[PDB]
Amino acid sequence: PDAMIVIDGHGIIQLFSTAAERLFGWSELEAIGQNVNILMPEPDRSRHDSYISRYRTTSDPHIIGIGRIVTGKRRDGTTFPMHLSIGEMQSGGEPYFTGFVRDLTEHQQTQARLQEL
Ligand code: HEM
Ligand SMILES: [C-]#N
């Protein structure tokens, strides 16, 4: 039951788990109705809707069901690495996407500390 975010086909946050609140700093009510791009930094932020549009038309997976590390952005403006897995679903005839997130800040810190010593 980690950080899970569900968005519609236009990238608007539909569900936002409790763990996602603790990780991103946004309450579920504040997040719901916002675009998922509020969780990442630029350039990705301004680019995110184009990535979603691209996929929706080419039916071309780039990261759907792949799993990878990106940098996300918390409410206070701080950035952090996180592993992200996007899953695709359908409901009411329209696409929905789910993102499972695993915070990796601690890992990056440990790795960094071990490097500097
Ligand atoms: C918060 C950190 C995130 C960042 C930095 C990020 C970044 C990106 C990038 C760079 C792409 C396109 C990659 C490519 O075309 O190779 C992309 C695509 C997309 N993202 Fe995100 N994303 C984030 C979170 C999310 C979340 C949480 C969702 C769903 C809950 C989501 C849904 C999508 C979808 C549906 C696409 C298009 C899928 C595809 O191109 O196959 N993203 N994202
Ligand atoms: C986006 N992944």
UniProtKB/Swiss-Prot annotation:
Heme binds at residue 48. Residues 1-56 form the PAS domain. Residues 57-116 form the PAC domain. Putative oxygen sensor; modulates the activity of FixJ, a transcriptional activator of nitrogen fixation fixK gene. FixL probably acts as a kinase that phosphorylates FixJ. This is Sensor protein FixL. It comes from Bradyrhizobium diazoefficiens (strain JCM 10833 / BCRC 13528 / IAM 13628 / NBRC 14792 / USDA 110). The gene is fixL. The chain holds residues 153 to 269 of 505 of the full protein.
